[PDB]
Amino acid sequence: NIVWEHVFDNCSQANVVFSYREFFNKELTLPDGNCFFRAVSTFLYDTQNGWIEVKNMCREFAETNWDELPGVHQYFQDPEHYARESKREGYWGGSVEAEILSKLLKLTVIFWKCEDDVWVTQGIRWGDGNYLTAINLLHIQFDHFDFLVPI
């Protein structure tokens, strides 16, 4: 059992050390700048090939539900600013889209930080759920995300 500490809006955080293979199997995503969206696409569609649809749905939720996205507001002026920056191909996904997707899909999203391919040393969570029901991502160096499936 894990103690989540509230950070901001629907975002919380946990310092915790564990072997991620103790609780997860990993699925690698293609190492390009779309890796975040490929990991979410795997969760949603059981293939990484739908990363473009994940980018689209984030943009669309930003335009219809801008009022609900204070973490996105920290970095982008309005939905059009978000849409322009995310439509470029060297756009890297991350905590902005984890907030969007947690609220669009009514799901919990968790980044598990791992720097040696063995030990997780930190979790960051959007939503109130536990990891069994969450989109779990392995966040490693160079802003790469792989997908984690709970055992």
Residue numbers in the entry: 6 to 156
Which text from the study accompanies this structure?
One specific mechanism used by nairoviruses is the production of a deubiquitinating enzyme, termed the vOTU, that disrupts the innate immune response. Interestingly, the nairoviral L segment also encodes a viral homologue of the ovarian tumor protease (OTU) at the N-terminus. Instead, the vOTU’s primary function appears to be the reversal of post-translational modifications by ubiquitin (Ub) and the Ub-like protein interferon stimulated gene product 15 (ISG15). Each vOTU possesses a seven-stranded beta sheet as the core feature, with five major alpha helices framing the rest of the structure.
Similar to the pattern observed for HAZV and GANV, QYBV vOTU shows the most activity towards K11, though at lower overall levels. Additionally, QYBV vOTU shows a more pronounced difference in the relative preference for K48 versus K63 linkages, with substantially more activity towards K48. In QYBV vOTU, Trp72 packs with Pro85. Additionally, it is in proximity to His79, suggesting potential stacking of the rings. Specifically, direct interactions, or the lack thereof, work in conjunction with the other interactions to complete the structural features. This is most notable in QYBV vOTU, in which Phe14 appears to pack with Pro76. In contrast, the DGKV and QYBV vOTUs possess more polar residues, including asparagine, glutamate, and threonine for DGKV and glutamine and lysine in QYBV. Despite being phylogenetically distant from CCHFV and the other robust vOTU DUBs, QYBV demonstrates substantial Ub activity and possesses Ile130 that could pack with Ub’s Leu8. Further, increasing the hydrophobicity of the pocket in QYBV vOTU was able to enhance Ub-AMC cleavage, boosting activity by 150% and 50% for the Q19V and Q128A mutants, respectively.
